[PDB]
Paper text:
The mycobacterial HTH-transcriptional regulator (EthR) has been reported to be a facilitator for the resistance of the second-line tuberculosis drug, ethionamide. Studies of the resistance mechanism of ethionamide revealed that an increase in the expression of HTH-Transcriptional regulator, EthR, reduces transcription and the level of active EthA protein, and results in resistance by M. tuberculosis. The discovery of this transcriptional regulator led to the notion of controlling EthA expression levels by targeting EthR and thus boosting the bactericidal effect of ethionamide. EthR binding site is characterized by a long hydrophobic tunnel surrounded mostly by hydrophobic residues, many of which are aromatic, plus four polar amino acids and a basic residue.
We then managed to obtain X-ray crystal structures for compounds 1, 2, 3, 5, 6, 7, 10, and 12 bound to EthR. Another common feature shared between several of the compounds (1, 2, 3, 7, and 10) is the presence of a ketone that forms a hydrogen bond with N176 in all but compound 3.
Numbering used by the authors:
A (entry chain B): 15 to 214
B (entry chain A): 17 to 94, 98 to 214
Write the structure that this text describes.
């Protein structure tokens, strides 16, 4: 037996979408459970049949965005096209440009929660480690086929490149200064990846 | 020379703070700990600093300026790969010799507008410097004209900010600290001279 809950799942989804909307204008501290309940069309007691706190709502939101990026990247890893090397790295990076770039408010809220929440910190750290291991393995496969030279240890080169994308894409999304303009940040990272993976 | 301009108590306050941030964040440091390290009563502290946050901002002002003037010294008295290595190694060595203040300064960026503006100001200045050197290396024909120089400069300087911090904080993921400078030099040099 499997317990399908179309109605409970749909309302959970409306709470999550309500939170994501509110985060575009206000930090999580300025959002109340009543704002969440009212956005989701339920009473405030009813909210607690779906989440225990507004922090659990944000943790679920970050779960959703991080796993959407992870799954999109894994989808690329299992369906390799007949394409050039620059396009390979560009579509991989664009997974993160497009996923987090379409969820800017949740991304900003997650970064801010990284210092106060161990779950968020360990969530982000877990997925960075996996994406770095994946990058390292693609770098090594490019070395094995003779397409990239054996320079730095793959995992170290992978770590610095993925940390660059983290800092740089966030600076673009959050409109920080300094930042690369959002319309130019993909080309910028792709160039640095491709030159440093294939050059000596 | 590099001596803090105040008397011995101002030095003692700053060094006690820097020492204690080695194992505790600033919230776990009291004004009393700072005053005790300088040998003064608690109210006497406020003849030197208005708050313990002011002490951390002054310590980070010293680190950031020590970095900027070691780099401006490089600019006055000059192979391409080693030029970038010595410039990156200014930050590896400066912030690597103040890991406690660097890590406390990073945490204070979220809560202090002075700290965030301080960091953003010198990052802009350091990125402009990188961008000018890239432009001079293109005008003499040594580097290809690929990305806009200021945009390539920004990502590499943000790379270093986030990668050196991860090494110095022992984060996972991070590059081991004995290997971080070669890693960043290689990426800087391939991306600045590659087509
Ligand atoms: O991590 C990122 C993005 C994510 C979005 N960003 C964030 N900034 N703060 C955030 N935060 C804090 C708490 C919650 C979220 S997320 C900026 C960058 N990466 C990994 C590196 C790279 C991955 C890759 C691997 C293999 C092949 C191609 C590409 C592509 C980009």
């Amino acid at each position: 037996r499997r317990t399908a809950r179309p109605s409970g799942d749909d309302r959970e989804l409306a709470i999550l979408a309500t939170a994501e909307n509110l985060l575009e204008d206000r930090p999580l501290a300025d959002i109340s459970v009543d704002d969440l309940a009212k956005g989701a069309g339920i009473s405030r007691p009813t909210f607690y049949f779906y989440f225990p706190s507004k922090e659990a709502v944000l943790l679920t939101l970050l779960d959703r965005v991080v796993n959407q990026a992870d799954m999109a990247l894994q989808t690329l890893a299992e369906n390799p096209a007949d394409t050039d090397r620059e396009n390979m790295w560009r579509t991989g990076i664009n997974v993160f440009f497009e996923t987090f770039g379409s969820h800017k408010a949740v991304t900003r809220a997650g970064q801010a929660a990284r210092a106060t929440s161990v779950e968020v910190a360990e969530l982000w750290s877990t997925f960075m480690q996996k994406w770095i291991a994946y990058t390292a393995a693609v770098i090594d496969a490019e070395r094995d086929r003779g397409a990239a030279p054996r320079t730095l240890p793959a995992h170290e080169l992978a770590t610095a490149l993925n940390l660059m994308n983290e800092r740089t894409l966030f600076a673009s999304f959050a409109g920080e200064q300094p930042s690369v303009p959002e319309a130019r940040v993909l080309d910028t990272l792709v160039h640095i990846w491709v030159t440093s993976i294939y050059g000596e």
